[PDB]
């Protein structure tokens, strides 16, 4: 009961994990058990996807969200993004599920029977939240581990099988990225690009060379920073600019992870290179431009001159000019003129969509892709009725992009709220008024009245 | 004893009438810019081609609007969610043609309310009060970001954000219902529960505190003067109100603890508005409310209508009539 | 001409807000 009740700790059961702040070994067990939970879900869910996967439909039409990741990494997928084998997915699932047993045993061990505090039996692993050097060493070790993970992706893309390039010549295919871009002006040119329309910040990766080269850069950065933090202590400007408690570190991680959640949501929504449209389905811009393309092809086939056809308002019904002058698909797709997908670039010249290619050389596969991506737009209901809100119940479908984007935007906002809570509490507890205002020395009564 | 130290003391001073602080350093200029541009654009601004079809919409008072119909129109659909500051326009006139003031006002205002959250935290730290009033403010801000920023991002156009007016707000509501069925979406229902329960608990708490006020006032004097600012004693009998509310429903329902009561008061509307802001954020990426249309069919298999179908008829009328000249293709995918 | 009335009413509301913020009755503790 000691250390596990409100009397001896001051924390209720519903703030129960707040009793783990100064209990290092039990807190380690908490973390390891929760990591076991994460890997358990990964293995169980990807096994569930393998079990429910039918070889007829594509991945995006079946509600599959995890197998697309493995397909992008280059496992069990052939040319055109056709999933030929699903045994590597099974292997990944069983490996994660089995590793979950080990991580769960470790977490339960350290939580229940392991030493409560590691600072007397294992001084190497023990720590104090206020000991800046040890915490920075732990941070640096984890940074080295993250760099090793980035280099693992690099090794997969470069040597072991390679990754799926949807932009590959011919159709999209699994290929070895032999020449990643290591130029700083490109990798950090992405990082300093604007997030608004046309720029996209780091969501605008249009090739796998930039992705793999910048993962090399991230690996180098993380390993160098980890060795920097292992052999260094925070400088005086940093030592006065932060609250050095466990809750403050938690709040910092929370804000960072919330930003990552937002960025990942927009990655799944807008990017179609690290999230190819043949695994995750069309983007919203992709579906809209596909509708415009399908009706352009239909009306051109029926005798219309699409370039010279006038819409109701005087603008192009099929083809118009973007605000910068590029020839683009017309209608309400005008906002989505920044789309670049491997099925529509083939008809794209320096000045936009080439009119000669648009008139004489639209291939049947482009029409098929446009029809498929039109009919499989991200629109859908919570109960998975595909189409607009005013549709009928015949089509059961919500795009994986919608699910991933909505979930990770939700979690990003929630973790911003968590950051605000925990950062405020860290500041208040460090200053020492997180329990209330002292009736003896109230600061406001000492302050001179305003007005 | 250094100029920077004196500046930091002045900025973080609890003696200014209105606290500035470091978050106020970012809030005051941004909010003042947004206020100035909003006032100038609402009183006088040329019509804006919201839909990118060269059909300008008037939103300013000088161009034949009242306070109810006036608005700062959303940006042109041709722009999309491209950044459109004044310096990216060939002229200021064509900056106003495509609704750049909306982008300016929305960006500055969102930054300003973020600064307001941070400034609320800051003053509390200077005060020595506990944080979290800031956390409560986030729920209103989250909704504002959902409607002004996240919905354009998901739909891909600043034309889709809510207009900065009253009639434009109603227009945005009706189009949102037509395209997403927000009423049937459960997060909006949680928000409706949040606001209705906030009103219910506000009325209830005010009624019970006002009802059990301790007699400290004469008959020819307002009861509010029975409370003196800064007094140590409670101004009303918590026991009397608690017992009355226990007899009203049942004893177990009442909040005998005042701190738990006020936590619940702060919790219910904040969580409700968080949920509805998140619902708008998710319908930005087209995860719509429930679609029970044609969910009941007879033994033959013909559709017996339900209230969902009759709601669908209104949604369909709004869908067909919204932006009559903007759509050239049957599906409203954008 | 109604823009005159609308602007006057909005400016009057803003002025009332200004005077309420900056010329309030100062709170003081009774004795």
């Amino acid at each position: 009961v000691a250390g596990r009740d409100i009397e001896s700790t001051g924390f209720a059961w519903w703030s129960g994990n707040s009793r783990l702040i100064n209990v290092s070994g039990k807190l380690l067990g908490a973390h390891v058990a929760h990591a076991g939970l994460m890997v358990f879900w990964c293995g169980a869910m990807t096994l569930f996807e393998v079990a429910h996967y039918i070889p007829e439909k594509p991945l995006y039409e079946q509600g599959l969200i995890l197998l697309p990741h493995l397909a992008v990494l280059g496992w069990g997928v052939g040319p055109g993004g056709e999933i030929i084998d699903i045994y590597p997915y099974f292997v990944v699932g069983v490996l994660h599920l089995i590793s979950s047993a080990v991580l769960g045993f470790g977490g339960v061990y350290h939580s229940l029977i392991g030493p409560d505090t590691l600072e007397e039996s294992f001084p190497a692993f023990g720590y104090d939240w206020r000991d800046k050097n040890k915490i920075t060493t732990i941070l640096g070790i984890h940074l080295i581990v993250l760099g090793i993970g980035a280099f693992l992706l690099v090794i997969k893309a470069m040597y072991v099988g390679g990754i799926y390039d949807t932009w590959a010549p011919g159709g999209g295919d699994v290929r070895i990225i032999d020449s990643p871009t290591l130029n700083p002006g490109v990798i950090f040119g992405y990082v300093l690009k604007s997030p608004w329309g046309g720029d996209g910040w780091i969501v605008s990766v249009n090739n796998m060379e930039d992705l793999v080269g910048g993962h090399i850069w991230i690996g180098i950065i993380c390993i160098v920073g980890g060795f920097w933090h292992i052999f260094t202590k925070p400088f005086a400007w940093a030592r006065r600019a932060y609250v050095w408690s466990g809750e403050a570190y938690l709040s910092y991680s929370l804000v960072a992870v919330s930003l990552m959640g937002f960025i990942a949501s927009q990655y799944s929504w807008y990017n179609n290179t690290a999230y190819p449209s043949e695994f995750y389905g069309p983007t919203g811009p992709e579906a809209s431009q596909s509708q415009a393309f399908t009706f352009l092809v239909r009306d051109q086939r029926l005798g219309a001159n699409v370039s010279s056809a006038q819409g109701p308002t005087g603008l192009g019904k099929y083809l118009m000019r973007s605000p910068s002058g590029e020839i683009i698909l017309g209608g309400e797709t005008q906002r989505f003129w920044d789309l670049r997908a491997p099925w529509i670039e083939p008809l794209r010249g320096p000045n936009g969509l080439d009119l000669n290619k648009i008139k004489n050389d639209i291939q049947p596969w482009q029409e098929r892709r446009a029809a498929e991506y039109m009919t499989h737009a991200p629109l859908g209901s919570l109960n998975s009725v595909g189409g607009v809100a005013t549709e009928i119940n015949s089509v059961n479908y919500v795009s994986p992009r919608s699910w991933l984007t909505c979930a990770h935007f939700f979690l990003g906002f929630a973790f911003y709220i968590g950051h605000l809570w925990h950062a405020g509490r860290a500041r208040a507890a460090a200053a020492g008024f997180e329990k209330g205002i002292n009736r003896e020395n109230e600061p406001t009564l000492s302050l001179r009245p305003i007005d | 004893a250094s100029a920077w130290e004196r500046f930091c003391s002045w900025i973080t001073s609890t003696d200014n009438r209105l606290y500035i602080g470091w978050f106020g350093v970012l809030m005051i200029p941004t909010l003042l810019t947004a206020t100035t541009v909003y006032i100038i654009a609402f009183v006088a601004a040329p019509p804006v081609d919201i839909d990118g079809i060269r059909e300008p919409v008037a939103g300013s008072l000088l161009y034949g609007n009242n306070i109810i119909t006036g608005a700062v129109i959303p940006s042109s659909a041709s722009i999309g969610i491209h950044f459109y500051p004044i310096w990216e326009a060939a002229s200021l006139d064509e900056w106003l043609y495509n609704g750049g003031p909306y982008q300016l006002i929305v960006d500055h205002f969102l930054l300003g309310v973020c600064g307001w959250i941070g400034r609320e935290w800051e003053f509390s730290y200077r005060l020595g009060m506990r944080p979290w009033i800031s956390v409560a403010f986030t729920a209103p801000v989250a909704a504002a970001s959902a409607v002004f920023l996240v919905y354009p991002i998901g739909q891909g156009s600043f034309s889709d954000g809510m207009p900065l007016g009253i009639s434009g707000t109603f227009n945005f509501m009706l189009v949102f219902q037509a395209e997403h069925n927000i009423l049937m979406h459960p997060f909006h229902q949680l928000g409706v529960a949040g606001v209705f329960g906030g009103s219910l608990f506000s009325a209830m708490h005010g009624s019970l505190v006002t009802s059990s006020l301790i007699r400290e006032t004469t008959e020819n004097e307002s009861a509010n003067y029975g409370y003196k600012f800064g007094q140590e004693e409670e101004t009303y009998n918590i026991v009397a109100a608690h017992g009355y509310f226990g007899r009203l429903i049942f004893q177990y329902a009442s909040f005998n603890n005042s701190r738990a009561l006020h936590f619940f008061l702060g919790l219910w509307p904040v969580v409700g508005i968080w949920f509805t802001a998140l619902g708008v954020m998710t319908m930005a990426f087209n995860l719509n409310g429930f679609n029970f249309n044609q969910s009941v069919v007879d033994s033959q298999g013909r559709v017996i209508n339900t209230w969902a179908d009759i709601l669908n008829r209104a949604n369909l009328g709004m869908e067909v009539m919204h932006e009559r000249n903007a759509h050239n293709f049957p599906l409203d995918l954008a | 001409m109604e823009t005159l009335v609308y602007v006057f009413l909005l400016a009057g509301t803003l002025g009332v807000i200004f005077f309420a913020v900056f010329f309030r009755d100062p709170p003081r503790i009774a004795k």
């Binding site: 009564l445 001179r448 | 409370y227 600012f229 | 009755d25 003081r28 503790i29 009774a30």
Partner: peptide, 24 residues
């Protein structure tokens, strides 16, 4: 000591209350 009891002696008091106070 901070000065919260000075600068607005009529605050929080009605006409009748403050009037009877001022007449002691």
């Amino acid at each position: 000591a901070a000065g919260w009891f000075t600068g607005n002696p009529s605050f929080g008091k009605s006409l009748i209350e403050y009037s009877e106070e001022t007449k002691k």
